[PDB]
């Protein structure tokens, strides 16, 4: 019954179903294959902050798949070198670049420096190509305050899109971030291996 679950909290459905279901001594193997979320429940969830059609309208991209690229090496680049790699990719014809999933705020590249240099790279390549550009700034953070702070800085400097590692961050952080993104007009890229 739909009454068993908190509205707009789809994992509360998920962990009730399999999170803590060991067996009652009658089951030696369990596997959740499919879940029918009724429309009544779907309407209570935030869902994608923008979705395909609005995203295409915001970035003015039509008629083809979008092209992206994770900056490599995954770790080790300084912020300025990171922005150089981003700038070169974007000016060459990619629609997006992105932080690696585990690029957060490391000693070799603090997040605020990365955001600034990447945003400078994004604006430069956009001016030199005449096409809208973006870079998924990774706001995945140890605490929600830190996550929101990075997302706020992304919005402040005009970054059109951010990313969140759902595995690292978790449902609560992601759901809050997605609501924030709709409130602030920022596109949200999700990675979940």
């Amino acid at each position: 019954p739909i009454d068993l679950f908190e509205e707009g909290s789809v994992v509360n459905v998920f962990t009730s179903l399999v999170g803590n279901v060991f067996g009652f001594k009658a089951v030696r193997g369990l596997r959740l294959e499919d879940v029918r979320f009724p429309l009544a429940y779907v309407k209570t969830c935030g869902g994608p902050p923008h979705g395909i059609q609005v995203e295409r309208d915001k970035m003015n991209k039509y008629g083809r798949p979008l092209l992206g690229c994770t900056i490599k090496p995954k770790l080790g680049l300084s912020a300025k070198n990171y922005g150089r790699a981003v700038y070169e990719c974007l000016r060459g014809g990619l629609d997006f670049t992105k932080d690696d999933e585990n690029i957060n705020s490391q000693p070799f590249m603090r997040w605020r420096d990365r955001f600034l240099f990447v945003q400078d790279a994004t604006e430069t390549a956009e001016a030199q190509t005449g096409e809208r550009k973006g870079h998924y700034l990774n706001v995945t953070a140890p605490t929600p305050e830190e996550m929101y702070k990075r997302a706020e800085f992304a919005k402040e400097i005009g970054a059109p899109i951010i990313m969140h590692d759902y595995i690292t961050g978790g449902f609560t952080a992601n759901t809050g971030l997605a609501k924030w993104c709709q409130d602030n007009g920022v596109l949200l890229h999700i990675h979940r291996a």
């Binding site: 070169e88 240099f117 400078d120 790279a121 430069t124």
Partner: peptide, 10 residues
């Protein structure tokens, strides 16, 4: 005119 940008063309 863009000499003060952080990211020059490489």
């Amino acid at each position: 005119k863009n000499s003060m940008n952080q990211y020059w063309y490489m």
